């Protein structure tokens, strides 16, 4: 998942 601020789990 792309979280604001990166791609992260899952």
Structure solved via: X-ray
As a whole number of angstroms, the distance between CA 10 and CA 3 comes to 11
Q: Output the six-digit token pair for 2.
A: 């792309």
Resolution of the experimental structure, in angstroms: 1.0
CB 7 within 8 A of CB 1: yes
The helix (H) or strand (E) run that includes residue 2 is: strand 2-3
The two three-digit tokens of residue 4, written as one number: 């604001």
For residue 10 the two structure tokens come to 């899952």
5 sits in the region (left: phi over 0; alpha: psi -120 to 50; else beta) called: alpha
The whole-angstrom separation of Cα 2 and Cα 9 is 9
Residue 1's contacts (CB-CB under 8 Å, 6 or more residues apart) are 7, 8, 9
Are the beta carbons of 8 and 1 closer than 8 angstroms? Answer: yes
Q: Please list, residue by residue across 1-10, b when 16 or more beta carbons sit within 10 angstroms of its beta carbon and e when fewer do.
A: eeeeeeeeee
């Amino acid at each position: 998942t792309y979280r604001v601020x990166t791609w992260e789990t899952x």
